[PDB]
User: Fold Uridine diphosphate glucose pyrophosphatase NUDT22 from Homo sapiens.
Amino acid sequence: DPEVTLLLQCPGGGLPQEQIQAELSPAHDRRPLPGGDEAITAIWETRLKAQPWLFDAPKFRLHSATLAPIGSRGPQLLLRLGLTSYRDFLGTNWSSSAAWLRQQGATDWGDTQAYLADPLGVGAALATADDFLVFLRRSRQVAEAPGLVDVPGGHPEPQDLAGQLVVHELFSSVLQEICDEVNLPLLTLSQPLLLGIARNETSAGRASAEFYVQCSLTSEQVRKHYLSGGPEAHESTGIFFVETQNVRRLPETEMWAELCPSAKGAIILYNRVQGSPTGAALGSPALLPPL
Ligand SMILES: Cc1occc1C(=O)Nc1ccncc1
Assistant:
């Protein structure tokens, strides 16, 4: 899977909100482009002159994420964040020249991402009460990953002492994205655990935080909620469910070729962090069948 790279695998089965620190600093921003940010402005102008209803939005930028020594007390992860925008993404990660920007950032800064917007996405491995994960089918008419399978998620918008409010907005955003797209009541959802961070190499290395969320409804009840919104209550064109039993071997299935990169990152991290038992009971052959 060359289109996805793991930046972070969390310990302990995944980290809760209370164990994560953020540092939000202009030192973590994109570097101005070599020949100036006028190249971003030009792309944006061209786009607005064809689609004048489009609007910019701020986004969080991922600079880096450092894990504490495993087994330690205190905060377990430090997220280094800056600010970016949808406009800066369209002018850098989405540009035809994005690979040239990656080479120049290696030359100039020793950092392939230094000239890239790299907005932080969020995604969920969302489990039902009857042990299925939730999948969504993408419209064949959108610009990004048309017609491919996704998981719930999105790209959160801004508004350890500004840090803790930023970590709160990241965790809140993955629940809000599940309520808005799957049409689930907020009180049917567990507090999220962070599983890790995955990069999309087809989008010049932009990263997504991947979370585990448990729902108290069965697959049948989740389907009813999604569908009862009607076609205008969701951006996706369909919902479907895979038993957690069968997610273990998903990369060997014909489904794997239809998964978008950020959904592949969610399923690899689910399998490594929530799957893959370490203990004698769950690791016994009748409960963890070989192969
Ligand atoms: C990544 C991180 O975020 C906040 C603190 C740390 C960290 O590394 N903590 C630590 C270092 C050394 N011994 C024990 C714990």
